[PDB]
Design a protein around this nucleic acid. Structure first.
Lengths: 604, 122, 218
RNA sequence: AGUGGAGCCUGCGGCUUAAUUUGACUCAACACGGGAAACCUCACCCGGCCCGGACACGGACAGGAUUGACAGAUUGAUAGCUCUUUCUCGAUUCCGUGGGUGGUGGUGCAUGGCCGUUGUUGGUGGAGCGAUUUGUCUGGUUAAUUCCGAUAACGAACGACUCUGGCAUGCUAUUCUUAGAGGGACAAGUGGCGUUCAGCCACCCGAGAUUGAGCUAACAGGUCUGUGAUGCCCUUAGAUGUCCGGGGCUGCACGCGCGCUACACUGACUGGCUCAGCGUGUCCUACGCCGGCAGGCGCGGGUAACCCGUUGAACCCCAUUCGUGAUGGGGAUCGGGGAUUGCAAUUAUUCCCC
């Protein structure tokens, strides 16, 4: 109670008044001296006499730091030294709380003043191997967000460079334990840079001192590269709020793009981190350099004297460059990519479909203007390339169709009713990502037909009678249609109209009589979804038919699908009486039925 | 979902307890060093151990550096196990030999030995 | 489902060892009963020689247990003998069956007079001894059958011995000693050397040395 | 501190009785059966009404078989379960004769229903033909086959399972068909949510970030009333037959034991003083009046940290009388009255006063 109370005064009474009070020193006069008395009392409450409230005391110091660090910094260095001293105990059960408190102090402060308070003793050449303040580097990594980058340069570049040099010097010297420890220490020091890139205050002047250093660290220092990439990504994701900062990042982007392109295009490496960095770093650069690099990449792809790995790497660069170009470059790239959709290489078709997905991904900008400019040609090409699409290329292509259904006009029903069986066959595609995309695309046609008419229910009835014949043909595509209806029954629950759903349920029972295991499994999934979704009052009319249908299934499919029947019996027994299902089922199922009761007995 | 098994955990635990020095940040170098350190017959659980050692070394590297320092006797026990001197202890300048051993060497055709010294029993 | 532990069991599980006699050729210990159940299998018949109760003396009191003497036999080939004491009679019986499968030995069959047809009797008179019990088996002419007490009659019929003369000495009233002695004699059929086996033995490769490239894989 | 000695009360034996209902006999027999029994609570005793099967045979019944019943007379009981009154009720029958014929029977045997999860000694190895032994132990330690360690012993008990596909321009007789082997996928990487550790979500790359095969049965985990044309023994000798009235359970020479009050002066009587807690209540009681006192009368609160109730307790403290004796200590046992509780207190229910 006292901890919650003191936290409430620290959060509500003193926290909004930092701007009026200002910085406090040891010789304050007004309410700043009262804040000094606050911290003196809460620091005196840290000694050995308490020894049991230390979780509460350390939480109080944590909230005090995150409340008042920025303007109470001259006085708290003694308590930071005391907190560093407390972690030197033999058995300290409050290590996590102390780490959280020091991290809150660093977050309110920044590393410079707290390193003035408790210095790192890993400055170059040490005597022993037991570093007592090794937790400060994880604290700084996890909790630096709002400091200056120039301190990171002028402190963490030379010392980490000397530690790396000492580690490699000891590496040819035979000692392989100290070298590994120093390499781990310098790699931990290089992981602080994403923390420093969070919200810098002088990134408009200090980024000039790190451009060549980050370039050489991403060029000939592989062990840092991922973190290096992450650092730049982290910077962008929360550091281009101002305009001079973004101007500096573009001015150095004109140097960083060839380096990142050369590292991505080299043979063998963390290619996907470099690709994500390239994607974001293209989303924050000027369009003329985008057009120049896109033209160079198109020249590299169209060159027949390039290897397949080089061609695929430059196609990945084309994928990255595609959403950030202007209308003319996007149109020319689309004209170049369009003949590649019929290529017999699955990789080339996959990259072309990824380009088509990426250019249609932007909801605004030159991609959207390209979509509204070339919708007819895109529809004709995507309907023409339906027959010769490879199995991996199904996964991005559906997403591209997704990106052209979300802004589709009313006079487009033929395109949808031609795409539907491909979408169902992709709901039973090999790739799980393709299955997820096909399910989301069926949902997207479900939403898209809710915009072409005034009444939603008859529109969904039309959407269903467009997919009803799929329950008639080949066994695998009937199972496809049952899975499609199983997915569709989950989002538009009442909008189909329960009676119609009931009819579908009855049809499912006929398909429950099939010999194939996949059709039976899909029917069981549909029955589970229907039991979950549609109402018990309309279930009670249709309990008997479906439970008779699952009753006379078989011995083999009963034994194989015992868990799905167990869950169905569980749901039916939960939603109705145990005794009705007990009489109306055949003999053996009774035993399975009774087991559900102790769940209802012993989950309580 | 997916959960790790006990066998992969204990084998990875022995591997990290023994040869922490050789392991690195990349995955397939961990896989090949785990392949060449110990005897693992099947590929799948070997890849599972490689993934688990990669995860735990990423976890250990984040941890404050002191676990790594206390791994110091392992190499000394290893360097002691493989210590040799600069000069062989069996390469002695003068070796004392019984008269009967000298007769045995003479009868076994090594009568022209030069490092031998015959000490009579006094 | 059988998951073998020994190298011999792994070779038997695969198609590397074709017959049980190969294991008899190199005198290897058989430690898994599934090897016997794999090679002989359905041809094995088992007769319980004796079920008898004992009161084992423990500090809680005398507790009743059952001791089972079980002879198992592939006719026209192989026999084993097993003794097991357990809490339950079924547990003792199945333990004795397992123990008798582990002790399957092959028996030599010869001819009494001229050698026309399949061998029917023992090749020579052999003697097995167990705890003052002596069992002597003498070759018999065709059609005589096994002239013996009922217990060695059971073991000799399971051995595929069609006919034999028997002479027992000692305390025959104890069944285990008597069965173990006749088992010892029908093992000494292959322990005996005749002028038939005078040719120098050509040494083949052992299964461990022949299928070592398969055994390193598992 | 006592008990065992005394009075009273209760328990068990014993003795009485028509009955003094009953299991247990040195802890687990001894205020256990919630058993503080006046009717029930009772298992005991003395009496008195009533009827007690189906089937077969023989009678009566529609010229009522039988059911129901107001008033009055009886017996120890308002007995239409008898008489006066015989009035209604329409087959729902009741009168004898019988029978190893028995059924709301008693008891045993065999096997099954209702619920889920998937210190002892084995297993394997060593010794002995075998009973057996080793494990389960020199030492130290521990409540202990525990722990440290030694050691012919090692391990134990009381769909997260196994296999496996997509892609190979690779090896093998081999880019289009083959079938052996070797690769490749491991949550590997990224971003968020996360005890910052278990995990979750989504995504890039990737052929594959999960596509297919195999796994009612077992329980000693609990526990309980169905099947047999089941064996015996009984069945106007009711496996406690229902009801009615009255008794008894308390009776008392005596043994073995739990308890209460005492033998007093560290005390008994009288007056004044001042302090609790665990708990209770729709019977707990506040207030006033009539009362010597038990108690009555009129009124309110409380289905409850509210009203009883600041729970107004007793020992203890301070003053009075007594003064070493069967005493004013101790109160049993008796004689009279009065008032409540309850259909009923006579064999004293309880309380009050001489």
């Amino acid at each position: 109670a006292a901890t919650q109370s003191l936290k409430e005064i620290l959060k509500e009474c003193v926290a909004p008044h930092m701007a009026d009070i200002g910085s406090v020193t040891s010789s304050a006069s007004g309410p700043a001296q009262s804040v000094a008395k606050m911290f003196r009392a809460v620091e005196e409450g840290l000694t050995y006499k308490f020894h049991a409230a230390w979780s509460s005391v350390l939480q109080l110091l944590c909230v005090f730091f995150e409340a008042c660090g920025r303007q109470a910094h001259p006085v708290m260095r003694k308590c930071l030294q005391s907190l560093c001293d407390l972690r030197l105990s033999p058995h300290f059960p409050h290590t996590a709380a102390l780490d959280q408190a020091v991290g809150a102090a660093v977050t309110s402060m920044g590393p410079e003043v707290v390193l003035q308070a408790v210095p790192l003793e890993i400055d170059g050449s040490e005597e022993t191997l037991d570093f007592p303040r090794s937790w400060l580097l994880p604290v700084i990594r996890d909790h630096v967000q709002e400091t200056r980058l120039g301190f990171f340069t002028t402190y963490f570049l030379p010392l980490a460079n000397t530690l790396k040099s000492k580690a490699m010097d000891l590496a040819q010297a035979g000692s392989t334990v100290e070298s590994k420890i120093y390499d781990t220490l310098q790699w931990q020091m290089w992981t602080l840079l994403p923390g420093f890139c969070t919200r810098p205050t002088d990134v408009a002047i200090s980024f000039k001192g790190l451009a060549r250093t980050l370039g050489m660290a991403i060029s000939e220092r592989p062990d840092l590269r991922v973190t290096v990439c992450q650092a730049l990504r982290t910077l962008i994701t929360k550091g281009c709020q101002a305009e001079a900062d973004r101007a500096e990042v573009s001015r150095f982007a004109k140097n960083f793009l060839p380096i990142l392109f050369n590292l991505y295009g080299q043979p063998v490496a963390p290619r996907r981190a470099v690709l994500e960095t390239i994607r974001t770093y293209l989303t924050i650069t000027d369009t003329q350099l985008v057009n120049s690099l896109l033209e160079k990449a198109s020249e590299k792809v169209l060159d027949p004297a390039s290897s397949d790995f080089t061609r695929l790497s430059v196609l990945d660069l084309v994928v990255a460059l595609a959403p950030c170009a202007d209308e003319a470059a996007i149109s020319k790239l689309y004209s170049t990519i369009r003949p590649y959709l019929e290529s017999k290489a699955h990789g080339v078709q996959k990259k072309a479909y990824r380009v088509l997905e990426e250019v249609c991904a932007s909801p605004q900008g030159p991609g959207a203007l390209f979509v509204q400019s070339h919708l007819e040609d895109l529809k004709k090409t995507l309907l023409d390339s339906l027959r010769s699409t490879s199995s991996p290329a199904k996964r991005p292509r559906l997403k591209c169709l997704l990106h052209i259904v979300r802004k589709l006009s009313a006079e487009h029903k033929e395109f949808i009713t031609a795409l539907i069986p491909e979408v169902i066959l992709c709901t039973k595609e090999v790739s799980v990502g393709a299955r997820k995309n096909a399910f989301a695309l069926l949902v997207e046609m479900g939403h898209a037909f809710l915009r072409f008419g005034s009444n939603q229910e008859e529109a969904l009835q039309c959407y269903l009678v467009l997919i009803y014949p799929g329950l008639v043909g080949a066994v695998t595509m009937v199972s496809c249609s049952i899975l499609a209806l199983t997915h569709l029954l989950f989002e538009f629950k009442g909008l189909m109209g329960t009676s119609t759903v009931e009819q579908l349920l009855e049809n499912v029972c006929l398909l429950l009589a099939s010999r194939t295991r996949d059709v039976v499994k899909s029917a069981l999934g549909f029955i589970k979804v229907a039991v979950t979704v549609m109402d018990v009052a309309h279930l009670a009319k249709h309990v008997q038919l479906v439970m008779e249908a699952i009753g006379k299934l078989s011995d083999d499919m009963r034994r194989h699908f015992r868990m799905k029947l167990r869950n169905l019996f569980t749901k039916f027994i939960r939603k109705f009486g145990f005794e009705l299902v007990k009489r109306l089922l055949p003999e053996e199922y009774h035993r399975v039925l009774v087991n559900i009761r102790k769940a209802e007995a012993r989950a309580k | 979902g997916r959960v790790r098994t006990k066998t992969v955990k204990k084998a990875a635990r022995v591997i990290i307890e023994k040869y922490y020095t050789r392991l690195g940040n990349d995955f397939h170098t961990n896989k090949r060093v785990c392949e060449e350190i110990a005897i693992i017959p099947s590929k799948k659980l070997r890849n599972k151990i490689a993934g688990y050692v990669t995860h735990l070394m990423k976890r250990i590297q984040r941890g404050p550096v002191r676990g790594i320092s206390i791994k110091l006797q392992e190499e000394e026990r290893e360097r002691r196990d493989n210590y040799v001197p600069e000069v062989s202890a069996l390469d002695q300048e003068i070796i004392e030999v019984d008269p009967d051993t000298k007769e045995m060497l003479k009868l076994l055709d090594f009568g022209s030995l030069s490092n031998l010294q015959v000490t009579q029993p006094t | 489902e059988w998951m073998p532990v020994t190298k011999l069991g792994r070779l038997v599980k695969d198609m590397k060892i074709k017959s049980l006699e190969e294991i008899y050729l190199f005198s290897l210990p058989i430690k898994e009963s599934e090897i016997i159940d794999f090679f002989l299998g359905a041809s094995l018949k088992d007769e319980v020689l004796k079920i008898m109760p004992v009161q084992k003396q423990t500090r809680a009191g005398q507790r009743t247990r059952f001791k089972a003497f079980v002879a198992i036999g592939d006719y026209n080939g192989h026999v084993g003998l097993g003794v097991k004491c357990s809490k339950e009679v079924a547990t003792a019986i199945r333990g004795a069956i397992i123990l008798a499968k582990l002790s399957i030995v092959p028996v030599r069959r010869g001819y009494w007079g001229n050698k026309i047809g399949k061998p029917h009797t023992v090749p020579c008179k052999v003697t097995g001894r167990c705890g003052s019990v002596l069992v002597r088996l003498i070759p018999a002419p065709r059609g005589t059958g096994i002239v013996s007490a009922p217990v060695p009659k059971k073991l000799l019929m399971m051995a595929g011995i069609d006919d034999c003369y028997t002479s027992a000495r000692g305390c025959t009233a104890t069944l285990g000693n008597f069965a173990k002695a006749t088992f010892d004699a029908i093992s000494k059929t292959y322990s005996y050397l005749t002028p038939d086996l005078w040719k120098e033995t050509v040494f083949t490769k052992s299964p461990y040395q022949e299928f070592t490239d398969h055994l390193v894989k598992t």
